[model samples]
Target: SMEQVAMELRLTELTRLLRSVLDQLQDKDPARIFAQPVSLKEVPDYLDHIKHPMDFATMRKRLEAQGYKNLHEFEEDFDLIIDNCMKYNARDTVFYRAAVRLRDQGGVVLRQARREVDSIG
Candidate 1:
């Protein structure tokens, strides 16, 4: 469970980082912009972060013992920070947020597609 929580956190962090980058890129190329949810460039680093296995209880215990509350709290803090950083285009929040969601979901779909393709051969 801790491992899963950690995995989720790491994935969330990666998503936010990529979204932030894409947001900047979109600003430069408003029309013909291309944003990827799953980036090949990030694969190696992400895989490295998951090189070790952890359990949920372990993660919880560690956080609590370290004076941190929970993953939800961490997420809340992340959102607050992202909210501030992404404030330049306040009017476009709805669109960009949707794009972020789509990008993240698209990454999963593309990953599954690749898996299916590999299995078919």
Candidate 2:
């Protein structure tokens, strides 16, 4: 239960951060903002490794515990998370779409995003 709580807490924190960043982008054009940074490409990877044991069992459990309603619902939420992470950051359209889709499909993709973000070296 504590582990789940921690996950939820971390997710909440991330959401807050994303929101704050979005607010910062509000006065600027999305296109211009997105053009400013190429480094944001690491976001997808950072999202992927936010948790360990990034397997179906853990993902299903986490989704269920979060009251996601169903797989589709969870997928949509995951997409939003990725979209927000990539917001106002220059990225390859094809790669961004694929990464977001993969994240929507499973937690491991989310974990991979996280790992990639953390490892941006």
Candidate 3:
């Protein structure tokens, strides 16, 4: 029980850290395209090209559930979402450009949060 308190505290901090990061992602993705899972009917070929799909809502749920043990795991979801966007859309397209910005700029937010979470974890 004594040891459990510290671990539980870490999980709570981790959840807060991830949610804050997710807010940044949503802020940058103003179009809300990255907010939810891609619809198969809307983007039928999405699954064909993307082996793994990711989104803010899904990550938020995972964070709420304490699914991530550390920043690396959380980073993977963010990376996956951006990577899928980059892969599905051409460079000339808006989605691809958006992904580029999110990857480079949103990455700054993630980087800062990681340091904070690292210290806590």
Candidate 4:
């Protein structure tokens, strides 16, 4: 069908145009990209801040009071809480704010993280 073939050709050209525009934008402003939905490179440090060894006893006692019978159970629950917070940060307001900050910084933090990984490898 001539019309069907024409429509397919148009679709291909549209896709090519979209790709070209995106590539130009990426080259001109690399930081304006969200390569991944969330960056987990800093997750460990963030988790450490939330659960320090100094506060271990206090945290454990609170967990026990809340019916977390053992340390393992308490740790699991604590981890789940941290996971939820991370998810919220990635999915909610924090992601947008971080994206803006990254755009402003030209994704310096992201580039540094990549360099660190490259050095390790």
Candidate 5:
């Protein structure tokens, strides 16, 4: 139970961090905003072959080079990385686990957006 509680707290923290990132993106591009939650679905390819784990620093630099202009862009790049992990049967790997946690918690912003809409209406 304690472990579960700790995991939940981490998820909440990750969600908060993701929201802060999104807020920064919105500030940079006020005309466009991510209006929906990001979702992932697996393909049959995920079951084919297990590949090697990704190098975090290398991947980070590559993503940074893409010059993401908004949260949506960043999420797309992140989703691709996660999807690759799924395709390679590498979900059990450390980085993939963190990606899953972040991806799942990141959805919280969508719920927050809905709540704001409800309150406004």
Candidate 6:
């Protein structure tokens, strides 16, 4: 079977759109920060600011587990990926700027995927 397109019925489109959005995030993340967990040791203040950090790896795992009940849940993690970065880094830094770029692009990416999910009816 094709592993990529192998999700069963019910939440199939949700995961499909999620996979689509996530792959774009992985591609467009210039800093590569969105792919994995943030290094806690590197930033002592990370946990102080962002209690629960999210990443593409976590999202992929969630995608595999069907952990998201709705598209908005996926959007939250998508936002979280960018939100956590902005929260931890100053607005004047490269890290914050990367988050800013990804946030803008992610909105469009998510929005485009959002429309496709509604078309299967």
State which candidate has the highest lDDT. 3
Give the per-residue Cα lDDT of candidate 4 at 56: 27
The segments of candidate 1 whose C-alpha lies over 4 angstroms from its true place after superposition are 31-121
The worst-scoring run of ten residues by lDDT in candidate 6 lies at 1-10
Clash count of each predicted structure:
5, 18, 0, 0, 0, 0
Best by TM-score: 3
Q: List the residue pairs that clash in candidate 1.
A: 1-56, 2-55, 2-56, 3-54, 3-55
How high is the lDDT of residue 104 in model 5?
Answer: 70
In model 2, the number of clashes is 18
Clashing pairs in 3: none
Lowest lDDT 10-mer window, candidate 1?
Answer: 29-38
Tens-digit lDDT track for model 4 on 66-121?
Answer: 44332244334433333444444654575445444434443443344335434633
- The lDDT for every candidate, in the order shown, is 0.39, 0.42, 0.85, 0.40, 0.46, 0.79
Which of the two candidates, 2 or 4, achieves a greater TM-score against the reference? Answer: 4
**Each model's TM-score, in the order given?**
0.27, 0.27, 0.91, 0.32, 0.34, 0.84
Query: In candidate 3, which residue ranges exceed 4 Å CA deviation?
Result: none
lDDT of 2 at 59: 33
What tens-digit string does per-residue lDDT give for candidate 2 at 1-121?
9998977776655444333333332223333322222332655564453332122233335544544432344445444444654553347775455445444444544455445434641
When summed lDDT is taken over every stretch of 10 residues in candidate 5, the lowest stretch is 31-40
Q: For model 1, what is the C-alpha lDDT against the true structure?
A: 0.39
lDDT of 4 at 65: 44
Select the stronger candidate by TM-score from 4 and 6.
6
